[PDB]
Amino acid sequence: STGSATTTPIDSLDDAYITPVQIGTPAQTLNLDFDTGSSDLWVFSSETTASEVDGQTIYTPSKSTTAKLLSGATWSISYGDGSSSSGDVYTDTVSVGGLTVTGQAVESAKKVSSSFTEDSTIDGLLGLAFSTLNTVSPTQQKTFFDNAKASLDSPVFTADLGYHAPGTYNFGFIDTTAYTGSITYTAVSTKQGFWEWTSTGYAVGSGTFKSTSIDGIADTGTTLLYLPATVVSAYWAQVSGAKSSSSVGGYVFPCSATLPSFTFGVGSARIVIPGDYIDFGPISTGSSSCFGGIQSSAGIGINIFGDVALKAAFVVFNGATTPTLGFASK
Incomplete structure (x- = not known):
């Protein structure tokens, strides 16, 4: 079926x-x-x-x-x-x-x-x-x-x-018509009950790719992308006027900005999140401060590949005896 x-x-x-x-x-x-x-x-x-x-x-x-x-x-x-x-x-x-x-x-x-x-x-x-x-x-x-x-x-x-x-x-x-190129599969740990995997790194905009292991979960029920503070700081440093606001609860940026893309690694493959996907709009109605879609996971205790990341890909949740996760561009 x-x-x-x-x-x-x-x-x-x-x-x-x-x-x-x-x-x-x-x-x-x-x-x-x-x-x-x-x-x-x-x-x-x-x-x-x-x-x-x-x-x-x-x-x-x-x-x-x-x-x-x-x-x-x-x-x-x-x-x-x-x-x-x-x-x-x-x-x-x-x-x-x-x-x-x-x-x-x-x-x-x-x-x-x-x-x-x-x-x-x-x-x-x-x-x-x-x-x-x-x-x-x-x-x-x-x-x-x-x-x-x-x-x-x-x-x-x-x-x-x-x-x-x-x-x-x-x-x-x-559905082989729903994605472009090939699907790259990566190992899953079920030890915490999640679809937990390890990204191979990231890039900000047109910048060079940083090879670094980032353990996190594929979570369709979380809106944003939550990553280590080092990674998130590197991203927002490329946006003029962006800052972390304790009063708002995360990174904000001027609504006049054009956001850079964010790339994450899946094995040797790369998924590119367009800058527009990272814009969550005014912090309050009519504000010129906009809320960022990439936020720090510090104090969550886990990195979360939420909807911001997942919607940039076609994602396979493979529940075979040895579970794996697949990502393709689309």
Whole structure:
């Protein structure tokens, strides 16, 4: 089997991407944030504290003939941005882009933090990291991908995120029309439960490539590119007037600037992030200070190849017995 679903930016900054997902019988379609940095499929629901719902579409298990309470199971998750959610668990039929899993754990939110409430466009998350990170207790649950894997034509999914445009998540096949050149594969460590890999270096604009190992995670659920302070300083030093602002929470630059590209290494291959992808616009409405899309990972504890980086590539998440990550230009 295979699946193919379009993923769409939630706003004009590509802050996140939503993908329609069918849950239950008859289908209830919710727009979920596919997150390769976590491993819980959770939804706004008929159980979510009413004051914490503001425009989201909810899953109502009592209206699904295939829903079953997973008795005694609870979940609770905290994300890198400080947001959180928790609740109880149902199993139900879940389909993505024509690919169906029966008995998927669907984590129903009883509580969500303010960031989730305030984002009316995101009805929940669909985790695509390794199932060892799943938070369901006392019986840990599998991700949609892990459940689907045995049925897939090939044990893979791909992320093809757009810049200010829709893109695609495919399951079970590699669309050879969706990228240019060849795919370069690189080793993954699953030790922390992430799609963790090591970039071979970077360049700023038309500058020389610096060969240096940068361990980080491929995380579709993080907006920006978070890299070591040395690398980030080298980038922003090439932008007149750019500076790190503790009041704003990162690097800012004059909105009048033209940003240089940023290149990262994948083995001997190179992925180029155009300068425009690094512009996250005014820090506040009407400001002439703009927020940068490359930020320091210092104090996160991990480097994160978020959407800014991933959307510059066609990315293969290879979940074979020895997992790997593939990157191609597009």
